[PDB]
Design a binder for this molecule. Structure first.
Ligand SMILES: NC(=O)C1=CN([C@@H]2O[C@H](COP(=O)(O)OP(=O)(O)OC[C@H]3O[C@@H](n4cnc5c(N)ncnc54)[C@H](OP(=O)(O)O)[C@@H]3O)[C@@H](O)[C@H]2O)C=CC1
Ligand SMILES: Nc1nc(=O)c2c([nH]1)NCC(CNc1ccc(C(=O)N[C@@H](CCC(=O)O)C(=O)O)cc1)=N2
Ligand SMILES: [Co+2]
Ligand SMILES: [Co+2]
Length: 159
């Protein structure tokens, strides 16, 4: 099982300036619940974006994809191809834009948080992958985050 998990603006933006232009504590808690105990696979830029406090993210096998053969990520495994990272029964791809796109053909689940923020797409933004016909979607209801933004969770799946 390979799943992707991400939060996006309605426009599809997931990242800007190497970070994320919002933070929803309820969404991060959901992220922790879904990924805890499992493999998480991330691009090197997303590793760099993790707060030092949660590098590596606890209770998870942290795997970092990089083309730098000697890149070191303390507490993580650094691999040079995505296939090396897919050995565990449940693997969660946690971004960013490049690695979501690379992982999508392997994926059967996407856990998507849509954030009700009006953020037009800009050059250099990281974007959510596009989910075609093969994906079946189940939406939840809109919720209010203590951060002030509304959000809702989509669970997409395919065989
Ligand atoms: N909203 C959300 O839910 C999330 C948002 N984000 C945001 O996304 C942005 C980062 O996404 P992005 O810029 O797309 O970068 P990624 O996080 O996708 O990492 C890109 C890097 O991964 C490595 N990589 C990519 N493809 C390959 C490959 N085929 N083989 C080997 N290594 C590879 C390279 O590392 P190297 O350069 O070391 O070779 C490349 O520079 C940040 O803004 C981050 O905050 C991230 C995760 C979730
Ligand atoms: N749905 C989703 N939202 C995100 O914000 C998100 C995502 N997916 N995938 C990757 C990603 C990259 N950034 C980050 C940043 C911080 C933490 C973090 O601190 N996580 C703690 C949260 C614990 C909690 O809040 O209860 C963890 O232990 O997972 C995780 C991912 N962020
Ligand atoms: Co689990
Ligand atoms: Co269903």
């Amino acid at each position: 099982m390979v799943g992707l998990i991400w939060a996006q603006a309605t426009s599809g933006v997931i990242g800007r300036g190497g970070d994320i232009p919002w933070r929803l504590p309820e969404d991060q808690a959901h992220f922790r619940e879904i990924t805890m105990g499992h493999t998480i696979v991330m691009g090197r830029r997303t590793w760099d974006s993790l707060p030092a406090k949660v590098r590596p993210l606890p209770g998870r096998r942290n795997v970092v994809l990089s083309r730098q053969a000697d890149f070191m990520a303390s507490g993580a495994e650094v691999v040079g191809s995505l296939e090396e990272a897919l050995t565990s029964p449940e693997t969660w791809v946690i971004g960013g834009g490049q690695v979501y796109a690379l992982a999508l053909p392997y994926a059967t689940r996407c856990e998507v948080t849509e954030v009700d923020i009006g953020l037009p797409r800009e050059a250099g933004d990281a974007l959510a992958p596009v989910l075609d016909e093969t994906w079946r979607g189940e939406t939840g209801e809109w919720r209010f985050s203590r951060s002030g933004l509304r959000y809702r969770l989509y669970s997409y799946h395919r065989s």
